[PDB]
Design an enzyme around this catalytic site. Structure first.
Site, PDB file in Angstrom:
ATOM      1  N   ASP A  82       7.907  -6.672  -4.234  1.00 34.33           N
ATOM      2  CA  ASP A  82       7.031  -5.575  -3.866  1.00 34.33           C
ATOM      3  C   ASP A  82       6.396  -4.989  -5.110  1.00 34.33           C
ATOM      4  O   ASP A  82       6.467  -5.643  -6.104  1.00 34.33           O
ATOM      5  CB  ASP A  82       7.718  -4.540  -2.898  1.00 34.33           C
TER       6      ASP A  82
ATOM      7  N   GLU B 173       1.980  -2.924   5.227  1.00 35.27           N
ATOM      8  CA  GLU B 173       3.031  -3.649   4.582  1.00 35.27           C
ATOM      9  C   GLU B 173       2.778  -5.136   4.386  1.00 35.27           C
ATOM     10  O   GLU B 173       3.561  -5.815   3.604  1.00 35.27           O
ATOM     11  CB  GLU B 173       4.274  -3.642   5.476  1.00 35.27           C
TER      12      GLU B 173
END
Ligand code: CL
Ligand code: CL
EC number: 3.2.1.17
Length: 162
Positions: free
Chosen positions: A20, A11
């Site tokens: 993202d 992540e």
């Protein structure tokens, strides 16, 4: 290697609001703030999660704290899910990790979707599962991450991450 170090790898860690792969406002260690297009909506949700007036910037410790809650929540979300739970209880430790990762990425719902892959994992038909998991938008949008996760399911080791 454990879930945390695994997810930290997949992540990242960013102290400033970001968008993202999907275009979502995110912060910290893969903490999704909103799917809204609004930046403001973002900073609001952030302020709310942190409990202070952030101006879209957090500390390390704050990221790690959202990080523990979100791993907790993903686990909870597996053990609460009539579909997931059986797979998770059937599996060995490493493979439990891989399941959690998917659930942290895609949500309980997201994952409960993979009916056939799940039945496959349950059965411990590793090679088959891995090729079914691969025929997915998940794989085609985030192929290296996906490959990591699928290898882990295939092998039951941490090689992909070493
Ligand atoms: Cl939260
Ligand atoms: Cl990727």
């Amino acid at each position: 290697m454990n879930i945390f170090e695994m997810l930290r790898i997949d992540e990242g860690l960013r102290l400033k609001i970001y968008k993202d792969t999907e275009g979502y406002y995110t912060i910290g260690i893969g903490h999704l703030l909103t799917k809204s297009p609004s930046l403001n909506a973002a900073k609001s949700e952030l302020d709310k999660a942190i409990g202070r007036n952030t101006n879209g910037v957090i500390t390390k410790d704050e990221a790690e704290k959202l990080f523990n809650q979100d791993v907790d929540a993903a686990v909870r979300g597996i053990l609460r899910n009539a579909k997931l739970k059986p797979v998770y209880d059937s599996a060995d430790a490493v493979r439990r990790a891989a399941l959690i990762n998917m659930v942290f990425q895609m949500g309980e719902t997201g994952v409960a979707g993979f009916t056939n892959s799940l039945r496959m994992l349950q059965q411990k038909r590793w090679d088959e599962a891995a090729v079914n998991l691969a025929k997915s938008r998940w794989y085609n949008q985030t192929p290296n991450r996906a490959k990591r996760v699928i290898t882990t399911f295939r092998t039951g080791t941490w090689d992909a991450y070493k």
